[PDB]
Amino acid sequence: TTHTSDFLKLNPSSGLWPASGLGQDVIVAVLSGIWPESASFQDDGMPEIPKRWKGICKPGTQFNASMCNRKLIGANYFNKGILANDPTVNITMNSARDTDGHGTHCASITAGNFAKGVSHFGYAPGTARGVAPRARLAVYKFSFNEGTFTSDLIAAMDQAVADGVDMISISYGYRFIPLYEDAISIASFGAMMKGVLVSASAGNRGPGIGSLNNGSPWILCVASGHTDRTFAGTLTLGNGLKIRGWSLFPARAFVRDSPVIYNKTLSDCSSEELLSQVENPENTIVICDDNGDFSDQMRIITRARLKAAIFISEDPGVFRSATFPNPGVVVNKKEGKQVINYVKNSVTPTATITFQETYLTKPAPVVAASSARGPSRSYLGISKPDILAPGVLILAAYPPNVFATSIGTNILLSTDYILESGTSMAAPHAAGIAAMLKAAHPEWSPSAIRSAMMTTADPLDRKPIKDSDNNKAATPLDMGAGHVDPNRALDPGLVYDATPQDYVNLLCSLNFTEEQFKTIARSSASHCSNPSADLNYPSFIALYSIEGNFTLLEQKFKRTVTNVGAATYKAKLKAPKNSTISVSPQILVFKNKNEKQSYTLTIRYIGDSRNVGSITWVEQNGNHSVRSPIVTSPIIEVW
Amino acid sequence: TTHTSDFLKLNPSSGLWPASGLGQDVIVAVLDSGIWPESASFQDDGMPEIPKRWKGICKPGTQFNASMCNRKLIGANYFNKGILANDPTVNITMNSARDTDGHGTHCASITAGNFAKGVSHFGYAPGTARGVAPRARLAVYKFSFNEGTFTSDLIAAMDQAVADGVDMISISYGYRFIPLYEDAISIASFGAMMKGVLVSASAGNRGPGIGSLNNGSPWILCVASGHTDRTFAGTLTLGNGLKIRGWSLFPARAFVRDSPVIYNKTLSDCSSEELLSQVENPENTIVICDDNGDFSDQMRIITRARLKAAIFISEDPGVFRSATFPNPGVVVNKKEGKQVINYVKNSVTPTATITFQETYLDTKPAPVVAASSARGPSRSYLGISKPDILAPGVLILAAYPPNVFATSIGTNILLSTDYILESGTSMAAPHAAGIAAMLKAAHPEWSPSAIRSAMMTTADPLDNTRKPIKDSDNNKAATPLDMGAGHVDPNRALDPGLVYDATPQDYVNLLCSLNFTEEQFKTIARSSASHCSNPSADLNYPSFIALYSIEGNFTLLEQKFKRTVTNVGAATYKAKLKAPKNSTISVSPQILVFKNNEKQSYTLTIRYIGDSRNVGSITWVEQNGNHSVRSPIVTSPIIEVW
Ligand SMILES: *[C@@H]1O[C@H](CO)[C@@H](O[C@@H]2O[C@H](CO)[C@@H](O)[C@H](O)[C@H]2NC(C)=O)[C@H](O[C@@H]2O[C@@H](C)[C@@H](O)[C@@H](O)[C@@H]2O)[C@H]1NC(C)=O
Ligand SMILES: *[C@@H]1O[C@H](CO)[C@@H](O[C@@H]2O[C@H](CO)[C@@H](O)[C@H](O)[C@H]2NC(C)=O)[C@H](O[C@@H]2O[C@@H](C)[C@@H](O)[C@@H](O)[C@@H]2O)[C@H]1NC(C)=O
Ligand SMILES: *[C@@H]1O[C@H](CO)[C@@H](O[C@@H]2O[C@H](CO)[C@@H](O)[C@H](O)[C@H]2NC(C)=O)[C@H](O[C@@H]2O[C@@H](C)[C@@H](O)[C@@H](O)[C@@H]2O)[C@H]1NC(C)=O
Ligand SMILES: *[C@@H]1O[C@H](CO)[C@@H](O[C@@H]2O[C@H](CO)[C@@H](O)[C@H](O)[C@H]2NC(C)=O)[C@H](O[C@@H]2O[C@@H](C)[C@@H](O)[C@@H](O)[C@@H]2O)[C@H]1NC(C)=O
Ligand SMILES: *[C@@H]1O[C@H](CO)[C@@H](O[C@@H]2O[C@H](CO)[C@@H](O)[C@H](O)[C@H]2NC(C)=O)[C@H](O)[C@H]1NC(C)=O
Ligand SMILES: *[C@H]1O[C@H](CO)[C@@H](O)[C@H](O[C@@H]2O[C@@H](C)[C@@H](O)[C@@H](O)[C@@H]2O)[C@H]1NC(C)=O
C-alpha cells in the first residue's frame, strides 16, 4: 500500500478521496484480530469519533479497554465456538490481539493510516496507507490459533452489523457446501438485509472453472490482480549485458564480478549431492534451468550455500511469493539464453546482481493465475466474481513478533510491514472503496454501491486485461466487470439498484425446504409469495447444459436502471462470440434525477467454453458510460 | 557519527559549533585511499560559497571527472608516481581519487561529513550522520591504492596539501620501527607544522604493550582511541522471565523466539565442528558457548553449523570492537553466563528469545581507552609524552563505498552498505582534526601548537561517572601514555584561558638538539630551515614526561622543565599540584599574574626514582574566574628507541 492507492488513481486533489474525506465519517469492520500498536493504526489526522458509534473495546489477554482510539475505534472477539467445542482448551491470546498477521495486514490495507518510511526489507519503500486512510476501524476476531469456528464467524458478523458498521471486509472462504450451510453467505444475507455491503475474497484455488467461493448474490466477490510494481535484482554480466530480473532477497547482498557457471550435469538444480560438488560454492554463481519447480531449486541452492543463482523461469508462482532466502535472480526464457550464451563463449564469465530495487510494468493489471474462477457453484445464476482489485504482493502492516521471511536455511526475520499475496489482499481494497462511496453518497444501498463499482470498472490494462495463467483476455468469470476505478465509481450516472425484499424474493425462488430457508434468512424475513430469480444485477450470465446435444438456446433478462446523474442513453452492444444479443428499448430517456427506467436484454446462443460480450449505456449529451459484462457458461456441478 | 558529536557535547546553540560556524570557512585535508564522492555525507546542502582563498583542483581520472567536486568536497587529488616508478608495468584499475577500499571515505565523513538523514549500520546506530565539523570543507588527497601504498606518494600528498593552503591535515596511517629521518609522516608533518598546519594522526592499534605507538612526533597531534557510551543489543529473555541486555551486531532483524536452549559441556567449548554437527535440529536450537578466550572462532564454528543462535559467554574486549556477527547470537558476561546456565540445568524445556538491531546510549563508564590503542612513550622520541589526546574510535558510524564488502551473514552471504561501523585510532584522529579545524576557525591567528594546547589543557581525564578514565585492557586508571591529557572537550577548548604556544623556530631548535648528521637533519627539515645555532630540547609542551634508565641501580633522579604560558583570556592563576606516586614535584613561581597576550614563564621540578609509569599533574586554576589549565605529568622507563 505504498503504491496501491496511486495505482488506483486516488488522490487528495479530486475524485473519491476529497469527495469522501478519505472515509473519515465511515466505519469498516474486519472479520484473526489486530496488532494495535502498529503505525498504521495510530490516529494522527483523525477527527473525533462519530456519535453514531457505540462499539466496545473489549478487554482480554494483553489487550485493555484503552487500546482503542479515533482510528481503531472498536475491538471485539468471539471464542465461544472454541470453548463449547472443548472447554479444556487454554486460549493463549484470549482477545482481539493478532497472533497470526492476516488480520493486521487486511486491516491496514483497508484503512491503514499514513505511515512514513516503511518497506518490506527495503522493497516497496514509501508511505503506507489504506485505500481509505481515514476510515474508522472496527475489529472482530473470530480466528484464533487454537481454532476457527463457523458459528464464531457468524457471531462476529452479526455483532458487526448490530454495531452499525458501514461496510464489512472478510478474507475467508469455504467451499463444497450449499448456501444453507455456508456460514459467510448466511451472515452476509443478514448484512445485506440491513444495508451493509460485504466484501469477500473469491479464493485462491484458481484457475480451474467454478473454483471460487463467496459467490453469493448478496456479496461483493473480489478477484486478485497484479499491479504494475516489480522487484529487481538487476543482473549485469562481465560483457556489459544488463538485465532487470526478479528478486526479493531480503537484504542488500553484495555480489559483484563473481564467477558464473553453467553445467548441464547440475543445471537442473535438483541434486544436493551434485551441487555439493561445485568447488568454492561461496564465491560462485550457478545457473538453473527451467524445470517447473523453482521453489525446490531455491531450496537446493539455499542449502548448498552458493553465492547466488540465476534461475530461468516464467512460472507465475514465482512472482506471487516473497520467499527468497538466498541471493539470486529469476530471468525469462529469452534472457536465460543470452546469459547461457555469454557463459559458454567465455573463460572467466562473471556476473553482478544488486537487490532491494523496486520499479513501477506493462501490462497491468493482470488476473492472478490462482485467483478463483466463476461461475459460482453456490449459485450459477449470477455471474461471479464481481470485480478485480490489487492482491499480488501487497505491502501492509504485520505483527512485529511473528515469522515474516527467511535468509539462508537457519535465519528467520520479522518485520512491521510485509508483502503478501491473495484474494485476501484484494477484498479489503474493494471494501475501503465501497466505504468511501458510501460516505460520498450516504443514501446509496449496498447494491447500488456495488453497481457504481462495477459498471464503472475498467476491462482494459489499453488492451483487454489478461489472464496470467494463459495470457488470453480475462473473462468476467476471471475478473467480473474489471479493475476497480474508484474515481469514476463516484459518478456512475446510472445504478442497478435493489432492495432487501428483492433478495428475499430471490432466496425464495431457490426452492429450499422452509427449514433451509429459515437457516439462511433467519429472522430478517418469513416464509414470500413473490418468488423471482431475475435479481436486478449489473452483469449477465447465460448458461447451457452439457448433458447431450447442443441446441440454439435463448435467454431474456429484465433490468431496471435508476438515474443518479435529465439525460438519455443509447445502448451499445457487443455480443459474445457465436451468439447474438438484442436490447429493448435501445434508448433510455430520463426526465430528472432518481427516475427509473427498465429494459430487456436477450441472448441467443449455443454451447459446446465461456464467451464474453457486454452492454454499455453511453450518455448522448454527456460523458457517462454504464457498462455491464455478459458471459455464456456451461452448467456445472453445484454444491 | 549518528551520536558522536552529541557525545562530545557539540551543538548549534553554544560552544564550538556556533562559534566556528560548524567549520564552514575552514579546510581539512584527508590523506586517503580517496573518497566515494556521491555519498550523502559529501553533498553540499547547507554549504555557503567556497572561500576565495582556495584554488585546489578537482583532478580528473578513472570514473572521476572535474565536475565531481562541490561546495563540500572542494578538492580532489591523487598521487601514484611512487607506484608507477616502482613498476611502470602496472595497470592501476582506479587511477583517480575514487575510493575502492573504504577507509578514506569513512575518515572523510567522520571529520567533515554533511548531515545525512536516516542512515544506520544494518539497523544499528540509526539517526542522522555528520562529521564532527559538519560544514568544514573537504580536500581529498589519495596516496593509497589497491595496487600499492608508497611513502613518497604519501609525502607528495601532504606537501601538496600544505601547498594548497589547507587549514588542517588528517591522516590515519602509521609506520613503526624507523628513526625520524626515515619516518615519512613525521618528515612531512615537520613541513606542515613549519607552515602553520596542524597534523592529526592516529596513534596506531598495536596496543596495549608499552611504546607501541607510531606518529609519536613533537610536531604531530597524536590521537588515541576511546569507547563511547553506545552499545548494541540482542536483548536475551529466558523462558523463566529473566531478561538480559547482552551484546550483538547481527546485521538483520532475526526472529528467535521461545527456542530450545541447550548447555552441554561436551560441546560447550564450541570448538569442534564435528561435535556441533551432532546436535539434532540445529536450525531450531540455541547452544550455549563457554568462555574459551577465542570468541571469533566460536562464532565461525557456530555459523558453519547453522544453529538458530548461540549464547556466548565472554568479556574479551576484542569482541566489543568488531562488527563481524554473521549468525544470530548474544554475548553475555561471566555472571550473566551463570544465570543462563543455571536456568537451563534446572529445567526441562528451557527456552530463550533474542531480539536484534537495538542500540543504547547509556553505557557506564565511558569513555574507556581501547585495549588495542597503541601506547607511549614514543620510540620515535621519548622526550615528549605521547599520545596527546583521546577521542572516539571504537565502532564509529561513517560513510562507506556502496560497492565493497561491508559485513557478512551465514558463511556465504556478503552485504554492502552506505554507512558502516568501524573501529581504530583511524576513526579517532579525524575527530580531533575536525575539532582542531573549528578551533582554528574560531581563532584564525592561533598556531598549530596553541590549538593542540587548547585541546589538551582543556581535555577531561574523567569519565561519565566522574572517575578517572579506565584502560580497557586492565580496568585500571588510564595513563597519559594511554590517553595523553584525556578525552577531547571541544566546547571548553574554545576558551582555554592559557595556551602553551610555540613557533616554527622552536621546532627547528628541537630538531637541532637531536644531533643527527646534517644529511639526516636535511632529510627531515628539508627546505624549511638550514643547518641552527640555538639547540634546545625543552620544547614548550602542554605535558610533562620524566624518564629513568633501567640499566642497573635505581637512584633518586631529578628533572626541571621550563614552560611559557601566554594568556588568551587580566587574571591570575594558582598552580595546583598532584605529584606522581613515589615522587615529589614543585613549581615556581606558584602564582602567575597577568595584566592583560601577556606571557609568563615558570619551572616545574620533579624528584623521582624508577623501578612502571606513575602519573600526576599541574593545573593552573584562575582565582577570579573559572579557567582551569591542566597538564599531565608521567614518569617512564627509558626504552629502546628506533
Ligand atoms: C490450562 O491451564 C491450567 C492452569 O490454569 C493447567 O492446569 C494448572 O496447570 C499447572 C501446570 O501443570 C499445574 O501445575 C496446576 O496444578 C494446574 N492447576 C490448575 C487448576 O490450573 C492446564 O494443564 C492441564 O491440567 C493441569 C492440572 C495438568 O494436569 C496438566 O497436565 C494439563 O495439561 C492447562 N491446560 C492445557 C491443556 O494446557
Ligand atoms: C559438470 O558437472 C559435474 C558437477 O559435479 C562435474 O562432474 C563431476 O566432477 C567432479 C570433479 O570436478 C567429480 O568429483 C564428480 O565425480 C563428477 N560428477 C559427475 C557426475 O561426473 C563436471 O566436471 C567435469 O566432469 C568430471 C567428471 C571431471 O572430468 C571434471 O574434470 C570435468 O570438469 C562439471 N564440469 C564440467 C565442465 O563438466
Ligand atoms: C595492462 O593493460 C593492457 C591493456 O588493457 C593489457 O594488455 C592487453 O591485454 C588484453 C587481454 O590480454 C589483450 O587483448 C591486448 O592485446 C593486450 N595488449 C594491449 C597493448 O592492450 C595488459 O595485459 C597484459 O599484457 C597482455 C599483452 C597479456 O600478455 C596479459 O597476459 C597481461 O596481463 C595489462 N597488464 C596486466 C598485468 O594486466
Ligand atoms: C552432549 O553431546 C554429545 C556429543 O555430541 C552427545 O553424544 C552424541 O550423541 C549423538 C546422538 O545424540 C551420537 O550420534 C554421537 O555419536 C554422540 N557423540 C558423542 C561424542 O558422544 C550426547 O548425546 C547423548 O549421548 C549420546 C551417545 C546419545 O546416547 C544421546 O542420545 C545422548 O543424548 C551429548 N549429550 C547430551 C544432550 O545430553
Ligand atoms: C561527468 O560525470 C558525470 C557523472 O555522471 C556525468 O553526468 C552523468 O551522465 C550520465 C549520462 O551517461 C547521466 O545519466 C547522469 O545522470 C549524469 N549526471 C549528471 C547530472 O552529471 C557527466 O555527464 C560527465 N561529464 C563528462 C564530460 O563526461
Ligand atoms: C493498559 O494499556 C497499556 C498496555 O499494557 C498499559 O501500559 C496501561 O497501563 C496503565 O495505564 C497507562 C496509561 C499508564 O498510566 C500505566 O502506568 C498504567 O499502569 C493500561 N491502560 C489502562 C487504561 O489500564
Side-chain angles (χ1 to χ4, degrees):
Chain A
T1 55
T2 47
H3 169 62
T4 256
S5 72
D6 289 321
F7 182 55
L8 296 180
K9 296 178 181 72
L10 291 168
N11 69 261
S13 304
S14 57
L16 216 197
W17 271 16
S20 66
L22 309 204
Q24 62 189 183
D25 189 42
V26 102
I27 304 174
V28 31
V30 182
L31 279 28
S32 66
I34 200 170
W35 194 267
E37 43 273 307
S38 164
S40 299
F41 309 126
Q42 307 311 310
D43 57 14
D44 268 6
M46 301 303 312
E48 290 177 321
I49 307 179
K51 43 144 140 285
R52 152 189 37 155
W53 178 256
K54 273 152 293 182
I56 68 167
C57 208
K58 179 168 185 180
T61 310
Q62 298 187 203
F63 201 112
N64 71 33
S66 72
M67 218 68 77
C68 286
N69 63 23
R70 330 226 289 196
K71 156 104 284 181
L72 201 222
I73 71 181
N76 205 334
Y77 56 104
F78 308 82
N79 56 7
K80 281 174 177 163
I82 286 166
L83 298 185
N85 182 73
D86 177 352
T88 268
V89 170
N90 284 343
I91 297 176
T92 307
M93 191 56 60
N94 203 356
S95 63
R97 173 159 263 96
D98 186 356
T99 82
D100 169 289
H102 199 273
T104 306
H105 204 79
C106 292
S108 53
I109 293 184
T110 213
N113 202 354
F114 296 97
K116 278 258 193 174
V118 302
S119 79
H120 166 106
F121 305 94
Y123 299 91
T127 302
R129 67 275 163 166
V131 72
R134 288 185 213 300
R136 315 294 178 151
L137 268 186
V139 169
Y140 302 84
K141 174 188 176 173
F142 74 90
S143 193
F144 289 78
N145 190 233
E146 293 85 358
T148 297
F149 279 81
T150 275
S151 63
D152 285 334
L153 172 27
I154 296 175
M157 274 221 48
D158 299 348
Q159 184 60 235
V161 172
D163 289 335
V165 133
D166 297 286
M167 296 287 169
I168 293 171
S169 184
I170 186 179
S171 297
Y172 286 80
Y174 299 88
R175 284 149 72 248
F176 314 126
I177 71 297
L179 288 191
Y180 50 80
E181 298 175 14
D182 181 313
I184 298 166
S185 195
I186 295 182
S188 299
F189 193 98
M192 177 71 85
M193 297 297 288
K194 318 217 172 186
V196 173
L197 183 71
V198 167
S199 296
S201 41
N204 303 294
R205 291 312 207 103
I209 191 176
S211 55
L212 67 70
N213 53 229
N214 297 316
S216 283
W218 44 87
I219 283 168
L220 176 59
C221 184
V222 187
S224 178
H226 295 252
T227 70
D228 58 3
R229 193 209 283 116
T230 189
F231 305 109
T234 298
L235 172 59
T236 308
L237 287 54
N239 71 187
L241 185 60
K242 176 171 169 177
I243 295 170
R244 185 209 281 186
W246 167 279
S247 194
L248 266 175
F249 179 77
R252 180 162 168 174
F254 174 72
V255 4
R256 180 182 173 194
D257 306 323
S258 295
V260 182
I261 71 179
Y262 175 68
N263 181 344
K264 261 297 166 61
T265 299
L266 51 64
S267 185
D268 197 37
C269 300
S270 67
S271 168
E272 308 171 358
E273 170 178 320
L274 288 189
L275 277 298
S276 82
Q277 297 182 196
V278 35
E279 297 162 349
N280 300 309
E282 336 212 83
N283 194 236
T284 145
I285 300 176
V286 74
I287 293 171
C288 291
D289 275 321
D290 181 343
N291 75 4
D293 196 5
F294 161 74
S295 71
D296 186 68
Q297 295 189 321
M298 175 73 78
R299 187 191 55 79
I300 289 306
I301 264 35
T302 299
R303 183 166 176 161
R305 282 165 147 164
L306 290 174
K307 181 89 163 183
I310 299 167
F311 303 95
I312 308 176
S313 182
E314 285 161 350
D315 162 5
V318 169
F319 307 96
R320 283 194 263 92
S321 179
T323 296
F324 222 107
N326 197 99
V329 232
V330 169
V331 293
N332 69 30
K333 254 278 170 277
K334 196 214 166 178
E335 294 163 352
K337 277 174 187 174
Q338 295 182 122
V339 173
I340 293 180
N341 218 56
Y342 164 86
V343 172
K344 276 174 170 168
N345 301 350
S346 308
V347 276
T348 293
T350 74
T352 289
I353 321 172
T354 52
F355 304 91
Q356 296 177 320
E357 306 161 28
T358 135
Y359 305 89
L360 310 170
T361 293
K362 293 180 190 159
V366 177
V367 177
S370 68
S371 203
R373 311 300 171 84
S376 174
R377 312 179 91 106
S378 292
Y379 181 87
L380 295 170
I382 292 177
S383 194
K384 296 279 162 166
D386 290 51
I387 204 168
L388 209 237
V392 181
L393 292 171
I394 304 295
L395 189 87
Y398 210 64
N401 63 331
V402 298
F403 164 74
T405 193
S406 203
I407 287 187
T409 73
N410 73 137
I411 309 171
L412 309 176
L413 307 167
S414 77
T415 174
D416 296 331
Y417 290 81
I418 194 177
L419 291 168
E420 190 68 69
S421 302
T423 42
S424 283
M425 280 58 263
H429 277 109
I433 293 174
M436 290 183 301
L437 287 169
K438 210 275 188 305
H441 307 109
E443 301 305 316
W444 282 21
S445 73
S447 296
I449 293 178
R450 166 172 54 196
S451 184
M453 292 172 68
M454 295 188 53
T455 54
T456 201
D458 180 357
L460 305 171
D461 65 30
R462 293 274 63 194
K463 310 197 225 306
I465 295 158
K466 298 283 179 298
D467 169 19
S468 162
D469 172 53
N470 62 182
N471 297 133
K472 297 158 178 287
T475 287
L477 300 184
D478 303 328
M479 71 185 186
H483 194 77
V484 203
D485 193 329
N487 291 326
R488 278 200 56 198
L490 171 69
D491 201 293
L494 303 181
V495 301
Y496 293 82
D497 212 338
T499 62
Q501 181 55 237
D502 284 310
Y503 290 96
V504 171
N505 294 346
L506 195 205
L507 179 57
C508 222
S509 68
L510 275 37
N511 289 350
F512 295 136
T513 77
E514 40 197 16
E515 191 168 341
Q516 295 168 340
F517 178 99
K518 275 296 294 339
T519 295
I520 303 180
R522 15 260 212 279
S523 74
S524 39
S526 61
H527 206 55
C528 218
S529 48
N530 294 302
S532 184
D534 213 9
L535 194 269
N536 192 35
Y537 214 77
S539 77
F540 304 87
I541 181 160
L543 302 141
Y544 64 82
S545 165
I546 69 299
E547 294 179 317
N549 292 315
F550 299 108
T551 209
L552 176 296
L553 296 173
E554 161 164 339
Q555 186 82 31
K556 282 191 160 64
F557 310 101
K558 192 171 176 343
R559 288 299 182 283
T560 297
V561 77
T562 144
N563 168 49
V564 296
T568 99
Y569 297 79
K570 284 152 182 275
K572 180 179 180 183
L573 282 39
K574 184 201 269 68
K577 198 152 306 191
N578 284 341
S579 85
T580 76
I581 82 184
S582 49
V583 65
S584 171
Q586 292 157 36
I587 299 179
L588 304 183
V589 194
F590 289 92
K591 264 192 157 60
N592 40 22
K593 193 144 204 170
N594 298 310
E595 180 182 328
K596 302 188 179 191
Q597 213 89 341
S598 302
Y599 72 81
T600 302
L601 176 76
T602 153
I603 328 81
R604 316 191 78 259
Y605 58 107
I606 182 171
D608 54 27
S609 171
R610 302 78 98 189
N611 300 328
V612 30
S614 58
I615 173 169
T616 320
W617 258 274
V618 24
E619 185 177 33
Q620 300 306 289
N621 271 331
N623 296 307
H624 280 105
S625 176
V626 190
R627 178 189 173 270
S628 285
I630 308 171
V631 70
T632 70
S633 171
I635 292 170
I636 58 182
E637 294 252 5
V638 163
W639 303 323
Chain B
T1 55
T2 45
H3 169 61
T4 254
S5 74
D6 288 324
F7 181 55
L8 294 182
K9 296 178 180 74
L10 292 167
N11 70 261
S13 303
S14 55
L16 217 196
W17 271 17
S20 68
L22 310 204
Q24 64 189 182
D25 188 42
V26 101
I27 303 173
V28 32
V30 183
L31 280 27
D32 250 352
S33 62
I35 201 169
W36 193 268
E38 42 274 308
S39 166
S41 301
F42 310 126
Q43 307 312 311
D44 58 13
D45 268 7
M47 302 302 312
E49 291 177 320
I50 307 179
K52 46 145 139 282
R53 153 189 38 156
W54 177 255
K55 273 152 292 182
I57 67 168
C58 208
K59 180 171 186 179
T62 311
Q63 295 188 207
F64 202 111
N65 71 33
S67 74
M68 218 67 76
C69 287
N70 64 21
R71 329 226 289 196
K72 156 105 285 181
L73 200 222
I74 72 180
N77 204 336
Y78 57 102
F79 308 83
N80 55 8
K81 282 175 178 159
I83 285 163
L84 298 184
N86 181 75
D87 180 348
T89 267
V90 171
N91 284 342
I92 296 177
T93 309
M94 190 58 54
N95 203 357
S96 66
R98 175 160 254 115
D99 185 359
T100 79
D101 170 291
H103 199 274
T105 308
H106 206 79
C107 293
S109 54
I110 291 185
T111 214
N114 201 350
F115 295 99
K117 279 258 193 173
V119 299
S120 78
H121 167 106
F122 303 97
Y124 300 92
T128 302
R130 66 275 162 164
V132 75
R135 287 187 212 300
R137 316 291 179 154
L138 270 184
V140 168
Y141 302 83
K142 172 184 176 175
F143 74 88
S144 197
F145 291 77
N146 189 235
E147 294 85 355
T149 296
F150 278 81
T151 276
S152 64
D153 284 334
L154 172 27
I155 299 178
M158 274 220 51
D159 300 350
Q160 183 61 234
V162 173
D164 290 334
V166 133
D167 300 285
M168 297 284 168
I169 294 170
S170 186
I171 186 180
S172 295
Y173 286 79
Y175 300 87
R176 283 149 71 249
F177 313 127
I178 71 295
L180 289 192
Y181 48 79
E182 297 176 13
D183 182 313
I185 297 165
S186 197
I187 294 183
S189 295
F190 193 100
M193 178 70 87
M194 298 294 290
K195 318 216 172 187
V197 172
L198 183 71
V199 166
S200 296
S202 43
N205 303 293
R206 291 314 206 103
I210 191 180
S212 54
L213 67 70
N214 52 230
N215 297 316
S217 282
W219 44 87
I220 287 169
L221 177 58
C222 185
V223 188
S225 176
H227 294 253
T228 71
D229 57 5
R230 192 209 283 116
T231 190
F232 304 111
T235 299
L236 170 59
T237 307
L238 288 55
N240 72 189
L242 185 60
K243 177 176 168 175
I244 295 169
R245 186 206 281 184
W247 168 277
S248 194
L249 266 174
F250 178 76
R253 182 163 167 173
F255 175 72
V256 4
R257 178 183 173 193
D258 306 322
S259 297
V261 182
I262 72 181
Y263 174 68
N264 179 344
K265 260 295 164 62
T266 298
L267 51 65
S268 187
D269 196 38
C270 298
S271 66
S272 168
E273 309 171 359
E274 170 177 320
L275 288 190
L276 277 298
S277 82
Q278 296 181 197
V279 36
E280 296 162 349
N281 300 308
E283 337 211 81
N284 194 236
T285 146
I286 299 176
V287 74
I288 293 170
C289 293
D290 276 321
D291 181 343
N292 76 2
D294 196 4
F295 161 75
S296 71
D297 185 66
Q298 294 191 323
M299 176 73 78
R300 186 191 55 80
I301 289 306
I302 264 33
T303 299
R304 184 168 176 158
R306 281 166 148 164
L307 292 172
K308 179 92 165 182
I311 297 167
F312 303 94
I313 309 177
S314 182
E315 284 161 353
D316 162 2
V319 169
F320 308 96
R321 284 194 262 93
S322 179
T324 295
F325 221 108
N327 197 98
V330 236
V331 169
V332 291
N333 67 30
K334 254 278 169 277
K335 195 214 167 180
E336 295 163 353
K338 278 173 187 176
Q339 297 182 121
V340 173
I341 294 180
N342 218 57
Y343 163 86
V344 172
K345 276 172 170 170
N346 300 352
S347 308
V348 277
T349 294
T351 76
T353 289
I354 319 170
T355 50
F356 306 88
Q357 297 178 322
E358 305 156 33
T359 134
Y360 305 90
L361 309 171
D362 67 15
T363 297
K364 294 181 192 161
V368 177
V369 174
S372 67
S373 205
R375 308 304 169 81
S378 177
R379 313 179 90 105
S380 290
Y381 182 85
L382 295 169
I384 291 175
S385 193
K386 295 283 165 167
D388 291 49
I389 201 166
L390 213 233
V394 179
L395 291 171
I396 305 295
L397 189 86
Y400 210 64
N403 63 332
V404 297
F405 163 74
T407 194
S408 206
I409 287 188
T411 74
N412 74 137
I413 308 172
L414 307 176
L415 308 166
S416 80
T417 176
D418 295 329
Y419 290 83
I420 195 177
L421 292 167
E422 191 67 70
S423 301
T425 39
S426 284
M427 280 58 261
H431 276 111
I435 293 172
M438 289 184 298
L439 286 169
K440 210 276 186 305
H443 308 109
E445 302 305 318
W446 282 22
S447 76
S449 296
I451 292 176
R452 167 171 52 194
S453 186
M455 291 170 66
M456 297 188 56
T457 57
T458 202
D460 182 353
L462 306 172
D463 72 33
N464 53 355
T465 57
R466 296 285 73 180
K467 309 196 228 306
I469 295 158
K470 298 284 178 297
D471 168 21
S472 161
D473 171 54
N474 62 182
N475 298 132
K476 296 158 179 285
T479 286
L481 301 184
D482 303 327
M483 71 185 187
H487 193 76
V488 203
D489 192 329
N491 290 325
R492 275 201 57 198
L494 173 67
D495 201 295
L498 303 182
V499 301
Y500 293 81
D501 211 336
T503 63
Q505 180 58 236
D506 284 311
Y507 291 96
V508 171
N509 295 344
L510 195 204
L511 178 56
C512 223
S513 69
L514 275 38
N515 290 350
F516 296 134
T517 77
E518 40 197 15
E519 191 167 343
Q520 294 169 340
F521 178 99
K522 273 299 281 1
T523 295
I524 304 181
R526 35 259 218 284
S527 70
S528 41
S530 61
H531 207 54
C532 217
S533 48
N534 293 302
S536 184
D538 213 9
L539 195 269
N540 191 36
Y541 215 77
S543 80
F544 305 86
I545 182 159
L547 302 141
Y548 64 83
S549 164
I550 70 298
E551 294 178 317
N553 293 315
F554 300 109
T555 209
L556 176 296
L557 296 173
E558 161 167 339
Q559 186 83 31
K560 282 192 159 64
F561 311 100
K562 188 163 167 10
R563 289 301 183 280
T564 298
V565 78
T566 142
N567 167 49
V568 295
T572 100
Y573 296 78
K574 283 153 182 274
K576 181 178 179 183
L577 281 39
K578 183 199 270 69
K581 199 151 307 192
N582 285 343
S583 84
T584 77
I585 82 183
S586 50
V587 65
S588 174
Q590 293 159 33
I591 300 179
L592 303 183
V593 194
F594 289 93
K595 264 193 157 59
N596 39 23
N597 294 309
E598 179 181 329
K599 301 188 179 191
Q600 212 92 341
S601 302
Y602 72 81
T603 302
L604 175 78
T605 154
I606 327 81
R607 317 191 77 261
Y608 58 107
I609 183 170
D611 54 26
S612 173
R613 303 79 98 189
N614 302 327
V615 30
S617 58
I618 173 168
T619 320
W620 258 274
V621 24
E622 185 178 34
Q623 300 305 290
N624 269 332
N626 297 305
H627 280 103
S628 176
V629 189
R630 178 187 173 271
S631 285
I633 308 171
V634 70
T635 71
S636 171
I638 288 169
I639 59 183
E640 294 249 6
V641 163
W642 302 324

